[PDB]
């Protein structure tokens, strides 16, 4: 049949940087109204009008005061707004009911470059909707039977929307921690033996997400822990900043060029260790990021 959810919570989870750079695509959630056993014959008009009695596009993280803004849409992907009814009655409305529970979907969309710390962003008010419906029922449950909100009259009795039925549900957005790593090649010079190379690695992480960065010993360690590039082999090593401190198995995210969504940048020098001829050697080093 058709029913109306009197209590309930909907939740979506998005990682924070992806949220900033891409927003969030139309996510389906339960509107409050659900119908099973509806007819799919499209022979009888499905009457359905909703009135949003309470709603918020603002989502607040209780522990920081930070907020997200969201767009809410009504299953025809029309933006819904408080204080304005929308009649969705058609012959085909019945095919918008989704899932096994027959949930009439609404959608939430997060736009823009919204940047917020990970946490739970709860809707500033619950979503309360008043529904007015008369849905044709599948034939095996009866002929000419309809699932109807209270006081509905499809029409010596005039047409009447009735008093409606109220749904109430809460909306939450969980923002998840998130990290991006960017580590380019270290390109040594010509050949005919090679000056050192001071390069860097960058990590853009969400605000409260510590980690350790370790580097292994490449594909061809020579005595167990001496890095070497494959042609014979050419020994090298990697050092934090311009120092003599070997970077290996490590570097805490708290201890390298971090100014403020945060970004860490790690400066390192790659040096040749030996008269050894050319040339064109290579290695691949594993960068382990550990949370």
């Amino acid at each position: 049949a058709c029913s109306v959810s009197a209590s309930g919570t909907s939740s979506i989870s998005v990682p924070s940087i992806y949220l900033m750079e891409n927003g969030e695509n139309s996510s389906q959630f339960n509107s409050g109204l659900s119908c099973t056993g509806f007819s799919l014959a499209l022979a009888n008009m499905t009457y359905l009008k909703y009135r949003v009695e309470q709603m918020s596009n603002s989502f607040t993280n209780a522990q920081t005061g930070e907020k997200l803004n969201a767009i809410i849409l009504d299953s025809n992907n029309e933006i819904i707004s408080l204080g304005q009814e929308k009649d969705m009655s058609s012959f085909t409305l019945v095919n918008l009911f989704s899932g096994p529970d027959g949930n009439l979907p609404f959608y939430i969309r997060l736009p823009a470059g919204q940047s917020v710390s990970p946490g739970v962003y709860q809707a500033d008010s619950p979503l309360k909707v008043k529904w007015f419906y008369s849905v044709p029922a599948v034939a095996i449950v009866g002929i000419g039977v309809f699932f109807e909100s209270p006081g509905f009259r499809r029409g010596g009795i005039g047409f009447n929307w009735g008093s409606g039925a109220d749904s109430l549900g809460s909306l939450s957005i969980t923002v998840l921690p998130d990290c991006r790593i960017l580590a380019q090649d270290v390109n040594f010079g010509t050949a005919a033996f090679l000056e050192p190379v001071q390069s860097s690695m960058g990590i853009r992480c969400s605000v409260n997400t510590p980690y350790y960065v370790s580097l292994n010993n490449g594909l061809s360690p020579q005595n167990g822990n001496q890095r070497a590039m494959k042609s014979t082999f050419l020994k090298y090593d990697i050092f934090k900043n311009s120092s003599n401190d070997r970077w290996g198995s490590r570097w805490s995210s708290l201890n390298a060029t971090i100014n403020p969504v945060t970004q860490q940048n790690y400066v390192f020098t790659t040096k040749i260790v030996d008269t050894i001829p050319a040339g064109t050697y290579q290695d691949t080093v594993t960068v382990q990021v550990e949370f």
Partner: protein, 216 residues
């Protein structure tokens, strides 16, 4: 290759048979990914990792081409003991004169037996409300090996602690420290406080100031 992997703090609740981690390539070059899941314990006062069949990743290897989004399914092969938080490490290896770099993500993963949860969901918060020891209970002691000084932290609770800043006012070069449930670990220190340590735990839904008393 620009790799995006989330969530980096996944968990499998007691009433869930599996959870998902997303692997998304937003770059223009393809990448190969290997996925393994290791059991994580702190026996011998240090972090140990071992092969395991309790949590099976699907797939164990994937090619993530440009613009692709794959799901990494983490499924429990068997049910866990009641009231227990099992710890694991999710390890995914990302493969896009020179030295090139490939990535390795070490990701903490927790799975829950009956009557205990992560506490990051409303439902799991209620589960832990009915459980007294569904939290970290931390004690410290300093005993000095051959022959430096080492701080010992013990957790008598059924849930882990993720500690960030210690002392009482801070130990630079320490981004975080894990004290797993019903475990003891030791670290590298110096100086003297000779009381109870002050710390910040990020295990739950919000950064909680946690107090840790001395073992005596």
């Amino acid at each position: 290759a620009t790799f995006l992997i989330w969530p980096i703090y996944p968990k499998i609740e007691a009433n869930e048979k599996a959870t998902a981690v997303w692997l998304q390539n937003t770059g223009k070059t393809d990448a190969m990914v290997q996925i393994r899941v290791f059991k994580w314990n702190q026996d011998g006062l240090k972090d140990n990792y071992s092969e395991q069949s309790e949590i099976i990743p699907s797939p164990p290897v994937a090619k993530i081409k440009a613009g692709e989004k794959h799901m990494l399914r983490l499924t429990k092969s068997v049910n866990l003991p009641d009231g227990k938080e099992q710890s694991y490490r999710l390890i995914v290896d990302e493969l896009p004169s020179k030295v090139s770099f490939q990535m390795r993500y070490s990701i903490p993963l927790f799975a829950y037996g009956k009557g205990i949860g992560s506490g990051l969901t409303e439902e799991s918060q209620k589960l832990n409300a009915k459980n007294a020891l569904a939290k970290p209970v931390l004690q410290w002691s300093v005993r000095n090996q051959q022959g430096q000084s080492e701080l010992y932290l013990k957790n008598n609770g059924q849930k882990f602690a993720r500690l960030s800043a210690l002392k009482t006012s801070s130990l630079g070069k320490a981004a975080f420290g894990y004290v797993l449930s019903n475990s003891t670990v030791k670290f590298a220190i110096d100086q003297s406080t000779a009381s109870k340590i002050y710390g910040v735990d990020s295990s739950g839904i919000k950064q909680e100031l946690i107090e840790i008393t001395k073992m005596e």
